[PDB]
C-alpha cells in the first residue's frame, strides 16, 4: 500500500535574520532550535511562541555550519576561518560567552556534530575528518581516506558510527573507536552535498548534484533511486521522518520534495520559500519539519 | 491569557529585534568586496591597510570591507558563499592560466549579476587588455559590467570607490526604469 | 555576582531616604530586578519591580505612590528613592535579580540586603500548614503548603518557587516551577504538587539545613510570601 498525497501548511515564520542562512538544528526537546546566518548570527528560536532566546554575535561573518548540543548546555559554530567556535549558554552570568576555540583544520568547516557533552565530530574541506575533546583541544582520531572536500556528516542513533559524504561521489562509513574507514559506497556520477542515517540505523541517504537521491544499506549496495526529469537542480539537505516512511529533499529550485522511503515517488511538494532550501531538518518527535532558505526566512510545517 | 513571565518573555524578544535593527541599520551602510587573483598578482592589501583575512578602509566617508582567503585549498564550493558582494577585485600580473581562471570566474552560475573589477598590477599594455575584455564582451548583456584598470601606487583606494559608485548609480538607474 | 546596600539608619517620620543596590560581576543590562522587603519579626513582601530597558515598572498595592525605582545601566547600579515613611517600613530590603526566558529561573541570587528602622484588592493568599515543624536530622521531611487559587496555568507551568533562608544570611532558591533543581542544591530536596496543594520533601538532613523556609506563587503577579515553617533542630 502507497501512502498517498502530503499536504503541509506553514504554521510559523521565524522572520528575524539579516541575511541568508545555510545551517540550522533542532534541539532535544523538541522545543528550541538554533539558525546561523552570514552576517554573523546565531539566533535561538522559541519554535511555539516564535520568540527569540539568544541573538549570539560571531567573530566570523562567513558560518557554514551549526549544531546544538544534546544537553542544550552548548552550541557550536564554524566556517571559512578554520575555527570551530563552542559558545556556553547556562551560565552564571546573563551573557553567552565562548567557551572553546578549535583551530586544527586549513580547509573550510563544512559540517560538526556533537556526540556528548565534551566530544565533537568536525568535517572540514581538505577532505579529513576528525574527532576532538571539548576540554584539553585536540584531534585524538583523524579520519583520513577522502579526496575532494567533504560537504556532509551524519551521527548513528547508537552513536558507533558515522558517514561522510565528500565532493568525489563517494560515501564512507568510519569507526569512531578504532578510526579507520570501513566501507565505502559509490554510485554517485556527481559531488555530494547531504547525508542522514535512516532511523533504524542500518541504512542511509546521500542527495547529490545531479538531482538524484540514493538509498544506501550498511548488504552494500544501493536499493532505491529519486528522481524525476522535471527536477534538474541539485540537492542541498536530505532528512528522513520518524518512522522513516517518509524523505523530505531540499533543491536549488525553491521547491522541497517529498519522497516515499518504500515506493519512491512523489508524495507532496513543500513550495512557499522566496530563494533556494539551504537547510532542512526533522524534530525528534516527528511533530514539525523545520526548513531555511537565502531569503533569511525560516518555516515551520506540520 | 499570558502569565507574568509570558511578557518579559516577548519584552526580552522586543529588545533582541530592536538590537537587531540598530544592528541592520549599521550593516547596509557598508560594501563588501572578494579579492581574488593568483599567487604571482603582488595581492595592495599591505598599501591599502586563519583561512580568510579581512581589510577595512574607509574613504571620502565610506567604509568597506575587503576578504581574502589564504589557507584554502577548488574554489567550486566556497565561491557560492560570496555571492552577496558589491564587487569582485581581480588582480592580474602567467597569461592563459589566469585568462582561463577570469573565464571561468565570469561564467560563473552563481556569481551571475555580479560585476568585477579587473586590475593589471602603448601597444603592447593593450592587448592583453583587450583579450581580457573579450570574454566580458561575449558574455552578460545586461548584468556584469566589468571594469578594466592599469595599476601597479597610492591611489588605489580612489578607483575602487569610483567603480563601486558608478555600479550603485547604474543599478539604481536601472530600477528606476530610467537606463 | 556580588550584590551590596548603601543606605538605612534612623529618620524622622515623613521624611525621605534613598537606598542602592549597586552590582558587580554580572551582565546588569539583561536583568530585571524586585526588592524584597522583610520585618525583624515577620515574613517577607514584595515593594517594587523594575523589567529590562525600564519598560515595565511595578509596584505594590501598599506603596503604590510613596516609593520610586531607577536605575543606572552604564553605572550599573540601581535604586529606590521614599518619600513620607509611615511606621510600617521598618524592616531589611534585598535586591534580587530575575531573568525570563523559556527556561530562566527567576529570583536565582538575594543580595545582602540594608536594614532601615523609622523612629516615632483581591490577591492569592497563600498559608503553610505548621509554621514550626521539628524533625529529627537525617529523616524524610514532608513539608506541606496551600494556595487559594490554582497556580496552574493553560500552559503547563505552574510557578510555584521555594525559598530557604538559614540564621543569618539571605533566602536562596531550592526549587522553581515545583519540578526543576536549582543549580547549587544537591538532589535530597524535591517538590510536588497538583494545583493548590505542594509538598516540598526532604531525604536527609544535615547540620546545614536549619532554617525557615518561605514559599512563593508569580501567577498573578502581585505576590505573597508567607510567614514560613521554621524547621527546629
Known amino acids: 500500500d502507497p501512502v498517498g498525497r502530503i499536504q503541509m501548511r506553514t504554521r510559523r515564520t521565524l522572520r528575524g535574520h539579516l541575511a541568508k542562512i545555510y545551517a540550522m538544528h533542532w534541539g532535544t526537546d523538541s522545543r528550541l532550535l538554533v539558525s546561523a546566518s552570514q552576517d554573523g548570527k546565531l539566533i535561538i528560536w522559541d519554535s511555539y511562541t516564535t520568540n527569540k532566546v539568544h541573538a549570539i554575535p560571531l567573530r566570523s561573518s562567513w558560518v557554514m555550519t551549526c549544531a546544538y548540543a544534546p544537553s542544550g548546555n552548548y552550541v557550536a559554530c564554524g566556517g571559512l576561518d578554520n575555527i570551530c567556535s563552542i559558545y556556553n549558554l547556562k551560565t552564571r552570568e546573563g551573557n553567552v560567552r565562548v567557551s572553546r576555540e578549535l583551530a586544527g583544520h586549513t580547509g573550510y568547516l563544512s559540517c560538526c556534530r556533537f556526540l556528548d557533552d565534551n566530544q565533537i565530530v568536525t568535517s572540514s574541506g581538505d577532505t579529513t575528518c576528525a574527532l576532538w575533546d571539548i576540554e584539553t583541544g585536540q584531534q585524538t582520531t583523524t579520519f583520513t581516506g577522502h579526496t575532494g572536500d567533504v560537504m556532509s556528516l551524519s551521527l548513528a542513533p547508537d552513536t558507533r558510527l558515522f558517514v561522510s559524504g565528500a565532493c568525489d561521489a563517494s560515501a564512507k562509513l568510519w569507526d569512531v573507536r578504532e578510526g579507520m574507514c570501513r566501507q565505502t559506497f559509490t554510485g554517485h556520477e556527481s559531488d555530494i552535498n547531504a547525508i542522514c542515517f535512516f532511523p533504524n540505523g542500518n541504512a542511509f541517504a546521500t542527495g547529490s548534484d545531479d538531482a538524484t537521491c540514493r538509498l544506501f544499506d550498511l548488504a552494500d549496495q544501493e536499493l532505491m533511486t529519486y528522481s524525476h526529469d522535471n527536477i534538474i537542480c541539485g540537492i542541498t539537505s536530505v532528512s528522513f521522518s520518524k518512522s522513516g516512511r517518509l524523505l523530505l529533499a531540499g533543491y536549488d529550485d525553491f521547491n522541497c520534495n517529498v519522497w516515499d522511503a518504500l515506493k519512491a515517488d512523489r508524495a507532496g511538494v513543500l513550495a512557499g520559500h522566496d530563494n533556494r532550501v539551504s537547510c532542512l531538518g526533522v524534530t525528534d518527535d516527528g511533530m514539525a519539519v523545520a526548513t531555511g532558505s537565502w531569503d533569511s526566512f525560516l518555516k515551520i510545517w506540520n | 491569557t499570558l502569565s507574568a513571565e509570558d511578557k518579559a518573555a516577548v519584552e526580552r524578544s522586543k529588545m533582541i529585534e530592536k538590537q537587531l535593527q540598530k544592528d541592520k541599520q549599521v550593516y547596509r551602510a557598508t560594501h563588501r568586496l572578494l579579492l581574488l587573483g593568483a599567487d604571482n598578482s603582488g595581492k595592495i592589501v599591505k598599501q591599502m591597510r586563519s583561512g580568510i583575512f579581512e581589510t577595512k578602509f574607509q574613504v571620502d566617508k565610506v567604509n568597506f570591507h575587503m576578504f581574502d582567503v589564504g589557507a584554502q585549498r577548488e574554489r567550486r564550493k566556497w565561491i557560492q558563499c560570496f555571492n552577496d558582494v558589491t564587487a569582485i577585485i581581480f588582480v592580474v600580473d602567467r597569461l592563459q592560466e589566469a585568462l582561463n581562471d577570469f573565464k571561468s570566474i565570469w561564467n560563473n552560475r552563481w556569481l551571475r549579476t555580479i560585476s568585477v573589477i579587473l586590475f593589471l598590477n602603448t601597444r603592447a599594455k593593450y592587448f592583453i587588455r583587450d583579450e581580457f575584455l573579450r570574454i566580458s564582451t561575449a558574455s552578460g548583456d545586461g548584468r556584469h559590467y566589468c571594469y578594466p584598470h592599469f595599476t601597479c601606487d597610492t591611489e588605489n583606494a580612489r578607483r575602487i570607490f569610483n567603480d563601486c559608485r558608478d555600479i550603485i548609480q547604474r543599478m539604481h538607474l536601472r530600477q528606476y526604469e530610467l537606463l | 555576582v556580588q550584590l551590596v546596600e548603601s543606605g538605612g539608619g534612623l529618620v524622622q517620620p515623613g521624611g525621605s531616604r534613598k537606598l542602592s543596590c549597586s552590582a558587580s560581576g554580572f551582565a546588569f543590562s539583561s536583568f530585571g530586578m524586585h526588592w524584597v522587603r522583610q520585618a525583624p519579626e515577620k515574613g517577607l513582601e514584595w515593594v517594587a519591580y523594575?523589567?529590562?530597558?525600564?519598560?515595565?515598572?511595578y509596584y505594590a498595592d501598599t506603596v503604590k505612590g510613596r516609593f520610586t525605582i531607577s536605575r543606572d545601566d552604564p553605572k550599573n547600579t540601581l535604586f529606590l528613592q521614599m518619600t513620607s515613611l509611615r511606621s510600617e517600613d521598618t524592616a531589611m530590603y534585598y535586591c534580587?535579580?530575575?531573568?525570563?526566558?523559556?527556561?530562566?529561573?527567576?529570583?536565582?541570587?538575594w543580595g545582602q540586603g540594608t536594614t532601615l528602622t523609622v523612629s516615632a484588592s483581591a490577591d492569592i493568599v497563600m498559608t503553610q500548614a505548621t509554621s514550626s515543624v521539628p524533625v529529627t536530622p537525617g529523616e524524610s521531611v514532608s513539608i506541606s503548603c496551600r494556595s487559594s487559587?490554582?497556580?496552574?496555568?493553560?500552559?503547563?507551568?505552574?510557578?510555584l518557587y521555594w525559598f530557604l533562608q538559614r540564621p543569618g544570611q539571605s533566602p536562596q532558591l531550592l526549587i522553581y516551577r515545583m519540578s526543576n533543581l536549582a543549580s547549587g542544591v544537591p538532589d535530597r530536596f524535591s517538590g510536588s504538587g497538583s494545583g493548590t496543594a505542594f509538598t516540598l520533601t526532604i531525604s536527609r538532613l544535615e547540620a546545614e539545613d536549619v532554617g525557615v523556609y518561605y514559599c512563593?506563587?508569580?501567577?498573578?503577579?502581585?505576590?505573597?510570601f508567607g510567614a514560613g515553617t521554621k524547621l527546629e533542630l
Open positions: 487559587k490554582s497556580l496552574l496555568h493553560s500552559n503547563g507551568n505552574t510557578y
Open positions: 523594575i523589567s529590562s530597558g525600564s519598560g515595565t515598572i
Open positions: 512563593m506563587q508569580h501567577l498573578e503577579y502581585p505576590l505573597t
Open positions: 534580587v535579580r530575575s531573568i525570563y526566558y523559556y527556561g530562566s529561573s527567576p529570583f536565582d541570587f
